[PDB]
Design a binder for this molecule. Structure first.
Ligand SMILES: [Ca+2]
Length: 337
């Protein structure tokens, strides 16, 4: 039965599809569906002393990546539909050092080895729980949502469950997701195809071009696109906005099968707003367009913002890209006039 008892977990997108192995974003909600497998136990009779050792389920999240305190338990349900949340002790174990001695001994003797922080669910009434669910072979399904720690900027995210029945430990699969590291860059040029003039001198009355380089959204991701917006507070005391342009930086495939080639003008899929009084510049991709980009396609664009230098002094610029609600701040650039 060692290979016939198999707790499992998966991670699912907003359409209930598995995204195990896929990339996610810093502000992503990770929703896992975990199974506590009792199928093998159906119709059998466990010894009373073995039943007394109870039924424990463990969710071992990577505590460097996942904020364990953000857990929302969406549901914990038996195969017969029963809500079993009130039948289980939910324990957020931050360290085993002084964990309840009985439970700590149970974990030790099980063969199971949770690392760092974990949650455990313990049947409050082993005999009752055994009779109602375990002996009937009724699996328990846990639906759990976590957020990431804001200080976890890159690396992989892992989640693994364990099951301890009658003191016997069993290992679940390791669900892995990659956190994309988001970066964007700003440069300042004499002209669109020219050389960087960062820290250079710009004569009054001349034009300069800022390039706002958008982050490329990678393939094999676990999400679709709902926002991709450039925001730039221009130093409008010194830089007078003239015009912009936005270009695809990768080939983009849409749901209809059509392809937008790298270098194509993307203006018609966007809206530019410039506020002359405040110097606030924004270019946002339209949601109905973003919704058509397939997951097997990369997505990226650069914006080029043309300004006239109207006053002497030091002139700085930076921009922020918002990708699905994640702000990505660029480096700064400066020039002097
Ligand atoms: Ca852990």
């Amino acid at each position: 039965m060692d290979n016939l008892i198999q707790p499992t977990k998966t991670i699912v997108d907003d359409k209930g599809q598995s995204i195990d192995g896929k990339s996610v974003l810093p502000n992503s909600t990770l929703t896992y569906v975990a199974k506590q497998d009792f199928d093998q136990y159906k119709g059998m009779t466990a010894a009373k002393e073995s039943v007394m050792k109870g039924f424990i389920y463990v969710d071992d999240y990577k505590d460097e990546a996942i904020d364990g305190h953000s857990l929302v338990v969406n549901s914990i349900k038996a195969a017969n539909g029963d809500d079993v949340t009130n039948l289980l002790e939910m324990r957020h174990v931050l360290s085993q050092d002084t964990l309840d001695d009985k439970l700590k001994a149970l974990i030790k003797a099980s063969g199971i080895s949770p690392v760092g922080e974990f949650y455990m669910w313990v049947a409050k009434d082993p005999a009752a729980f055994y009779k109602a669910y375990v002996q009937k072979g009724l699996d328990i399904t846990y639906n759990l949502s976590f957020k990431l720690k804001q200080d976890f900027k890159k690396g992989d995210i892992t989640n693994q469950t364990y099951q301890i029945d009658f003191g016997n430990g069993y290992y679940g699969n390791i669900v892995v997701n990659h956190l994309s590291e988001l970066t964007v860059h700003k440069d300042v040029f004499d002209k669109e195809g020219g050389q960087s003039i960062n820290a250079g001198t710009v004569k009054v009355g001349d034009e300069v071009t800022y390039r706002l380089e958008g982050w490329v959204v990678p393939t094999n991701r676990g999400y679709d696109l709902t926002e991709y917006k450039f925001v730039d507070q221009l130093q409008h005391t010194h830089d007078l906005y003239q015009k912009d342009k936005v270009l695809a930086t990768v080939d983009i495939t849409l749901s209809d099968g059509s392809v937008i080639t790298k270098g194509t003008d993307l203006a018609k899929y966007t809206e530019t707003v410039y506020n002359k009084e405040t110097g606030h510049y924004e270019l946002a991709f339209k949601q109905d367009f973003l919704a058509k980009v397939v997951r097997s396609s990369e997505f990226g664009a650069d914006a080029f913002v043309v300004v006239k230098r109207i006053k002497a002094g030091d002139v700085a610029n930076e921009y922020t890209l918002y990708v699905n609600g994640n702000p990505v701040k660029s480096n700064k650039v400066t020039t002097h006039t």
